[PDB]
């Protein structure tokens, strides 16, 4: 069919490429294997970029921004672009592991009757088919639930409720535990049993007053399985959820596991049985996606983000998100860009402004976005805003040719090295312009081969830099003085090449074409 894009996934050796089908193709980095080919739940061109800074895959369709952290090795993407519903009665859908399918449907058909649970014969249909129809393929493999809220979270509630009765630690009560808080955030619409989950506990340490300690800090602690449930002023009072144990007046030198193995060797969560602990491990792999407006009825036009704990992302009419990814992906503000500003209405020397290309930078952090104004004559142009809010720190009129030559912003990227920003501007036969970072460019070039349109950007660590132009020659290059080292050519009529990557841990660069072959390029 075709795959159309192409990122790679270090922490794994995972290719991630996507498909004109609009699914997303997982391919072994090592051999080239398909691993896996999962449509994503979305609803236009799919995004899958893995971010190194914030380490995490941000998917992004026209409207939400998926943001999957991997787990156990692999990562759940049935459901990465949905997003939460609003009424019990939706049909939420939930993925599991082809082992934790195993694990729930093994513990309702041979440890516990919660049958005659609301909507149980769906639940028992749909994980029996997902296994059958799965039987390095298989630790990607998952069973997709597509239930009414109300039905997957009763009979969620029904498992864990009966594997607490029995008490006999079976695999299928953390699997049960999981699926009851992917449902708690897919629909957010101390209470000791709402601390099962990772995330519910490190939220309970906002008043944890030993934040210097270099081992005891909130998040370790909810690692471990306490949460903080103060009782006093400065009471650094830690209890364990399943434990029953209860721990004060810490000090430096204190470590969670060590504080609760020796003071409760007998809990079931430290022994490292199945106990109902979610981790945060389980909820950052299947963390649902999120509007970055507040209603999610427009389209997402970019999905910047920043060598930075931040991921940025702007819509057609002008809002503007941006989250704090660093592990909640809580959105850390969200503002409007109106081009009537008084910076814009100076540099313009009736308007609307366009965003197309964003980032953020970090050795005061700011967002850059690459705008295009439209009277009428257009113009493109930067944008310096405030994150730590909305106030446009500078607008940055590009050099006089991008008045007539009918130019916008493409793409905006930090120097492979630092301390320097590459942007580049195509028509709405492009131009690469530098800037060196502001703690007119420090460099310019100009492209005009029709055939040698860039139609992508990874830029190698002025470090490197690998485009695709129009004409289906990845052009690896340095960005010192803009030296081809090899403008590899597309194969057999030709099929073009489209987008490429880097695999820091096997080395090869890979090359996706349009027709939707990979080719290993040595380097």
Known sequence: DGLHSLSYHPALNAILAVTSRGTIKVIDGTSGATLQASALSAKGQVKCQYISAVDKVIFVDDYAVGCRKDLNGILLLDTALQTPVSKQDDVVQLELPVTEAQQLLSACLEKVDISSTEGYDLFITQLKDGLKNTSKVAKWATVTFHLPHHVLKSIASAIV????????????????????????????????????????????????????????????????????????????????????????????????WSEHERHSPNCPFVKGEHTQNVPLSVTLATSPAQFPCTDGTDRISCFGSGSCHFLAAATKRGKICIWDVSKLMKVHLKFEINAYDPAIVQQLIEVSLDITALSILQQFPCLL???????????????????????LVQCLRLPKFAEEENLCIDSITPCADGIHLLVGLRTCGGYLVLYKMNYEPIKIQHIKDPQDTITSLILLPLGHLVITTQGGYVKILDLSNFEILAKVEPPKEQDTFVSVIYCSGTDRLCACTKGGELHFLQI
């Open 369 to 391: 976005a690459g705008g295009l104004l439209t009277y009428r004559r257009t113009l493109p142009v930067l944008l310096l805003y405030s994150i730590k809010p909305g106030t």
């Open 161 to 256: 409720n009966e594997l607490k009765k029995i008490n006999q630690n079976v695999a299928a009560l953390p699997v049960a535990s999981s699926v009851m808080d992917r449902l708690s955030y897919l629909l957010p619409s101390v209470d000791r049993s709402l601390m099962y989950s990772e995330a519910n506990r490190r939220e309970t340490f906002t008043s944890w007053p030993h934040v210097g300690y270099r081992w005891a800090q909130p998040d370790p602690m909810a690692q471990a399985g306490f949460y903080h449930q103060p009782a006093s002023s400065g009471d650094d009072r830690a209890m364990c959820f399943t434990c029953s144990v209860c721990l004060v007046c810490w000090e430096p030198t204190d470590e969670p």
